[PDB]
Design a protein around this ligand. Structure first.
Ligand SMILES: CC(=O)N[C@H]1[C@H](O[C@H]2[C@@H](O)[C@@H](CO)O[C@H](O[C@@H]3[C@H](O)[C@@H](O)[C@H](O[C@H]4[C@H](O)[C@@H](O)[C@H](O)O[C@@H]4CO)O[C@@H]3CO)[C@@H]2O)O[C@H](CO)[C@H](O)[C@@H]1O[C@@H]1O[C@H](CO)[C@H](O)[C@H](O[C@]2(C(=O)O)C[C@H](O)[C@@H](NC(C)=O)[C@H]([C@H](O)[C@H](O)CO)O2)[C@H]1O
Lengths: 211, 212
């Protein structure tokens, strides 16, 4: 099986920067192909036979390589080039793809705005309580959220979810959901959400009192 | 105008078989190969097989045994049958036409296929009520299988909306939030409805979100 390893998995670039990702093949091939994919929709063919541009692809894109070692290059990074790029060989069976190189846009540090939502009265009637912390419009991606109920640290009773880089302002958003039983929620008072993030000099806390 | 379009079940039980039809147009199956690719949720791409113009077939060796590809050139259709289903056959399936460089030049939309024995389950929808800027949202809890779509005021409100990717709960059910930031001044006058559609259970729910 011709395993295609792509370097790097994840990288960022400001507008106008030159970018170069690589594909490195376990067995020599003579022709490498590349697809571009945006946010779960169908891949588009982007480059075929190592360096020919497909229909629709701007001139800033090119490809190159031989044998074991190929690459896609963008002359000057643009906002609409945010995608995951997959290499592909059809020189022998099985036909194989790379793991993809995810390309995102650089921008400046941005601290999150932090909101916290008590559980609805609608949900409480049904017997569960979900407490939601929203971290909004931050950059870069990495962000620690931990929960406190009456100042006791919670552990593995919450999950995170994260937006793809926003296409207007190039930021992320994060939702954390602390799950409890109706009874357990109803025997404490102060629910708190402590977010830590590089754009903050000191971690920000948001809380509410149950009533 | 080369076009492909897949249609399959969406949810099938393990050990049953997945049947997907690709319906093409703008080229002739007598002269042209159609390939099949799949993408497991949140992972990359895997090639499955091909049926060429002449009727012959090359399958991926991990699967040459559980997979068949066939066609009816007249009906404009390519068929994929995959047996002895496993949980990791869960994936979005595409069909493709090789063109330039024998690389995949044209792709269908894709159909999500979830491999599980469990029954469909529509979500509960709960509001995340507001407290310059105010945040409000919808929590969409305990549905199966994917996907749900969310919109605000029937597509009229897109500025400031973040709909999160779905997270898997301990129940084995999905959950997902959509939030939107608006000005706090607009809470009195304006009306925020969230529009949640779960096609697999046939659920539509419109939740007016009110101030706390
Ligand atoms: C010819 C061949 O061997 N085809 C293989 C194919 O081999 C490729 C592949 O490995 C690539 C890497 O992706 O490397 C070589 O090709 C290079 C370039 O990628 C390619 O663009 C370039 O093409 C030239 C071409 O040679 C010139 O003649 C042309 O004028 O210009 C172009 C542009 O430069 O050539 C490069 C090498 O010099 C390899 O050739 O690999 C795939 C797997 O990925 C298959 O194995 C192909 O072989 C098929 O095998 C099946 C049986 O298993 C059939 O025999 C099939 O034939 C048909 C079919 O039955 O469907 C015959 C039909 O007549 C034909 N239809 C038409 C209208 O021609 C179709 C059709 O060609 C295909 O369905 C694609 O749509 O194929 C074999 O094709």
């Amino acid at each position: 099986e011709n395993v295609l390893t792509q370097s790097p998995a994840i990288m960022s670039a400001s507008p106008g920067e030159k970018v170069t990702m690589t594909c490195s093949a376990s067995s020599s091939v003579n022709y490498m192909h590349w697809y571009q994919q945006k946010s779960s929709t169908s891949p588009k063919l982007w480059i075929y036979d190592t360096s020919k541009l497909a229909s629709g692809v701007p001139g800033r894109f090119s490809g190159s390589g031989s044998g074991n070692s190929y690459s896609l290059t963008i002359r000057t990074m643009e906002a609409e080039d945010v995608a995951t790029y997959f290499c592909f060989q059809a020189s022998g069976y099985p036909l194989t793809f790379g793991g993809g190189t995810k390309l995102e846009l650089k921008r400046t540090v941005a601290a999150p705005s932090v909101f916290i939502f008590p559980p609805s009265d609608e949900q409480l009637k049904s017997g569960t309580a979900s407490v939601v912390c929203l971290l909004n419009n931050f950059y870069p991606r990495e962000a620690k959220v931990q929960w406190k109920v009456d100042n006791a640290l919670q552990s593995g009773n919450s999950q995170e979810s994260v937006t793809e880089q926003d296409s207007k302002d190039s930021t992320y958003s994060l939702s954390s959901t602390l799950t409890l039983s109706k009874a357990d929620y109803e025997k404490h008072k102060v629910y708190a959400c402590e977010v830590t993030h590089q754009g903050l000099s000191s971690p920000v806390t948001k809380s509410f009192n149950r009533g | 105008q080369v076009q492909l379009k897949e249609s399959g079940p969406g949810l099938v039980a393990p050990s049953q078989s997945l049947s997907i039809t690709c319906t093409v147009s703008g080229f002739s199956l007598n002269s042209y190969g159609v390939s099949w690719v799949r993408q497991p949720p949140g992972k990359g791409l895997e090639w499955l097989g091909v049926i060429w113009g002449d009727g012959s077939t090359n399958y991926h060796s991990a699967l040459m045994s559980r997979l068949r590809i066939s066609k009816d050139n007249s009906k404009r259709q390519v068929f994929l049958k995959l047996n002895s289903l496993q949980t990791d056959d869960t994936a979005t399936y595409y069909c493709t036409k090789p063109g330039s460089g024998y690389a995949f030049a044209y792709w269908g939309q894709g159909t999500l296929v979830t491999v599980s024995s469990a029954s469909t389950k529509g979500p509960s929808v709960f509001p995340l009520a507001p407290s310059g800027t105010a945040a409000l949202g919808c929590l969409v809890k305990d549905y199966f299988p994917e996907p749900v779509t969310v919109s605000w005021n029937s597509g009229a409100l897109t500025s400031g909306v973040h709909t999160f990717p779905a997270v898997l709960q301990s129940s084995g059910l999905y959950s997902l939030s959509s939030v939107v930031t608006v000005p706090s001044s607009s809470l009195g006058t304006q009306t925020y409805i969230c529009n949640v559609n779960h096609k697999p259970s046939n659920t539509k729910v419109d939740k007016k979100v009110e101030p706390a």
